[PDB]
């Protein structure tokens, strides 16, 4: 974590090692490897565990930080507790090591105690396996509402829950680490004086030490007639912001992804989006359905590769050597007189009825290093997270079919199978049958039924900038608006959604996506490129658009009169639309008082129907239990005789 | 029908006033049909004009650079004299 982004499961991994290495003895005042395999504990609905010598079983953790209890994948999330009361130096983090050690101490005051902990403890949660992103971020959550200055670099200021738990469930920052007192630590670059050894200048700071260092996030690209040391930059000090000379700076924050969580760090051009849309974007990316065919984004942040590696979805070699044999089911790798057979997951159901499936990424005779990729899982191409598709998009109103968040799409996304996904539903019949819930029986143990779902009206799509939409209309390709090269667009988004939501980053992404597709390029851009120069994103996008226009002889791609926009034509009539329209190829994902109103209208008989009496008869009996009687009498207006209603 | 001939522009407050006058003059059954026709006309024209939004359309006023640079200069001078002890911290905070 000193010169690379740390493994996203490192907190879970190191905590479990501490429990085995030191935690067991502290509570006991031998461990035997499990007899079954992890895939067996899932197939037989058993528990992956080790034998303590026979005191009982101790559940073991996977390298991905997950436990297998009664066949269910479970993750123990981190809790933050009181050790300014909201300062993180007065808080402490209790990880899986603290929780598993408490259970062992509770157990010694061994099997049923851990089965009951994983099944009932609120910090033990079923792993969200919707997509590779959901698996990796679940274990990094912090459970307890305001942002505190001590959070910077440790707790993400954007990623939180929506509803009533907002500000009480957060995410750990990408470079965060748990210290030796349950404290969160973040790395900073130390500016050292002339006379000091200073082997490693990267140091981790606990929240207590943070206030008393001068921490700057600016750069040193500024010179006047004076000297560089006297130039001023914004810095943090004593939980406030100053403007001081460089020579008074103690530390520098240099990591591009230091201050944000994984979800926020997957948003290109995030600095051009309002911070509220970046929160909504993090939630939407956790709802993205893996597609039957996967495709890398043209424009990314560069963190997609880290998510793929740490998720465990792909297959990575545990040993170097050469590839000898590959098929749909296995890959055979041999190195240094040792041959290994690696099975491949095929059409496996996940927690949320999504389809997991691995495809080989290597051929026979290819040399492999230890830790290199072998196969691509679902929503992963070439070792990168791939949650969506790059499609041709225009921003314009279209006859009210994209009113508000409604989205108009072309039929080519349907018959092209662009957004078709597999969904395997398990119900607790001959194999391969077509039952009618329509689908195909794929595995009988429990019956597993596979559904191929193409995109439909009513489905929800979203970009990475909090731009979420619902498909309202599917048009033939000849009815869609089309470009000056004749190609019809695939989706039409409402342009009125951008100014109100203030997410300009989608405008940068779509233009750059179009340039990349024409130039056969992908872009991985770290956030906050404005630190290099003013309008850095605008310079990057416009220059790449012009290069795409020049190289491919497509002048409409870069119009000097209005860069990024071009005149397009109505497919129905062939006439051009009056004003130029922004077009591009963004990455789009596919996602998984009434009584008073009636009384105000005076609709008395409608209200009576919607209420119907058993509600009142049951009320009388409950009042009778308190020695109270509630009698309903009708007095006749004709003869004044009182009638007791049968209640 | 003795409708007045508008000849300048129809914005949000102008259409709201017109609908209220149509309701008071023609009643709600007439105005409900008028609303459907006006709604259709607005959607059709919005599509034909095809308003959009690009980077260039996000126009900053010409004088922002002058104004920001002037504010930076005054803040920079005050920060120096704060370090000299000529103004106190509350004065720097207010400015």
């Amino acid at each position: 974590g000193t010169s690379t982004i740390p493994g996203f499961n490192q907190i879970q991994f190191e905590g479990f090692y501490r429990f085995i290495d030191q935690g067991l003895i502290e509570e006991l005042s031998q461990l035997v490897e499990p007899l079954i395999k992890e895939r067996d504990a899932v197939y037989e609905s058993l528990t992956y565990s080790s034998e303590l010598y026979f005191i009982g079983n101790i559940p073991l953790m996977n390298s991905l930080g997950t436990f297998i209890v009664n066949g269910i994948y479970r993750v123990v999330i981190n809790q933050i507790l009181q050790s300014d009361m909201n300062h993180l130096k007065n808080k402490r983090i209790r990880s899986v090591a603290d929780l598993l050690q408490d259970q062992l101490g509770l157990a010694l005051a061994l099997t049923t105690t851990y089965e009951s902990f994983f099944g009932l403890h609120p910090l033990s949660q079923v792993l969200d396996r919707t997509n590779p992103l959901t698996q990796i971020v679940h274990g990094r959550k912090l459970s307890y509402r305001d942002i505190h200055p001590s959070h910077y670099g440790r707790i993400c200021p954007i990623d939180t829950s929506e509803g009533i738990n907002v500000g009480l469930i957060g995410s750990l920052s990408i470079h965060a680490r748990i210290g030796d007192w349950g404290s969160l630590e973040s790395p900073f670059y130390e500016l050292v004086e002339k006379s000091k050894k200073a082997q490693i200048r990267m140091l981790f700071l606990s929240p207590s030490q943070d206030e008393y260092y001068m921490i700057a996030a600016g750069n040193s690209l500024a010179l006047n007639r004076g000297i560089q040391e006297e130039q001023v930059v914004p810095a943090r000090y004593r939980q406030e912001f100053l403007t001081i000379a460089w020579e008074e700076v103690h530390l520098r924050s240099i990591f591009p992804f230091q201050y944000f969580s994984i979800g926020a760090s997957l948003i290109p051009f995030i600095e051009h989006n309002d911070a509220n849309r970046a929160l909504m974007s993090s939630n939407m990316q956790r709802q993205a359905v893996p597609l039957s065919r996967s495709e890398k984004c043209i424009v990314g942040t560069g963190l997609e590769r880290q998510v793929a590696l740490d998720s465990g979805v792909p297959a990575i070699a545990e040993h170097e050597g050469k590839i000898l044999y590959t098929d749909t089911e296995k890959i055979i790798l041999s190195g240094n007189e040792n041959t290994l057979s690696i099975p491949l997951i095929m059409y496996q159901r996940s927690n949320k009825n999504t389809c997991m499936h691995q495809k080989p990424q290597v051929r026979r005779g290819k040399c492999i290093k230890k830790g290199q990729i072998l196969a691509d899982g679902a929503a992963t191409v070439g070792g990168e997270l791939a949650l969506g598709k790059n499609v041709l998009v225009a921003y314009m109103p279209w006859e009210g079919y994209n009113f508000e968040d409604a989205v108009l799409i072309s039929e080519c996304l349907v018959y092209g199978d662009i957004y078709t996904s597999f969904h395997i539903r398990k119900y607790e019949v001959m194999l391969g049958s077509w039952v009618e819930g329509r689908g195909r029986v794929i595995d009988v143990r429990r019956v597993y039924i596979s559904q191929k779902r193409e995109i439909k009206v009513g489905d929800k799509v979203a970009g990475r900038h909090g731009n979420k939409g619902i498909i309202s209309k599917i048009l033939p390709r000849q009815d869609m608006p089309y470009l000056q090269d004749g190609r019809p667009v695939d989706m039409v988004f409402n342009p009125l959604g951008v100014p109100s939501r203030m997410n300009v980053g989608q405008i940068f992404e779509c233009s750059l996506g179009l340039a990349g597709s024409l130039l056969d390029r992908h872009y991985r851009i770290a956030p906050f490129d404005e630190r290099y120069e003013q309008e850095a994103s605008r310079k990057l996008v416009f220059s790449e658009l012009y290069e795409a226009s020049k190289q491919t002889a497509n002048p409409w791609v870069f119009e000097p009169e209005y860069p990024g926009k071009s005149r397009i034509f109505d497919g129905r009539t062939g006439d051009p639309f009056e004003q130029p329209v922004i077009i591009g190829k963004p990455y789009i994902l596919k996602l998984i008082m009434e009584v008073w109103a009636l009384e105000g209208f005076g609709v008395a008989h409608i209200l009576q129907e919607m209420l119907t009496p058993e509600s009142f008869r049951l009320l009388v009996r409950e009042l009778r239990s308190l020695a109270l009687e509630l009698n309903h009498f009708l007095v006749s207006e004709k003869n004044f005789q009182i009638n007791r209603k049968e209640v | 029908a003795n409708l007045v001939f508008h000849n300048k522009v129809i914005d949000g407050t102008a259409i709201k006033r017109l609908i209220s006058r149509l309701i008071d003059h023609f009643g709600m059954a007439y105005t409900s049909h008028i609303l459907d026709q006006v709604k259709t006309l607005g959607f059709q024209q919005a599509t034909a004009t095809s308003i959009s939004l690009g980077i260039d359309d996000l126009l900053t006023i010409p004088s922002k650079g002058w104004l920001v640079q002037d504010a930076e200069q005054q803040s920079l001078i005050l920060e120096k004299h704060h370090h000299y002890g000529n103004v106190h911290a509350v004065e720097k905070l207010r400015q």
């Binding site: 009210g400 409604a406 009513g458 009042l623 | 259709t40 959607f43």
Partner: peptide
């Protein structure tokens, strides 16, 4: 009365007093 009666699972008993007290747009 003060501390209410509780069962073995540390739950306060409820008396009778406690008992009594998708859409898609169509422009056409």
């Amino acid at each position: 009365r003060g501390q209410p009666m509780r069962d073995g699972h540390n739950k306060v008993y409820k008396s009778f007093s406690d008992v009594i007290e998708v859409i898609v747009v169509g422009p056409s």
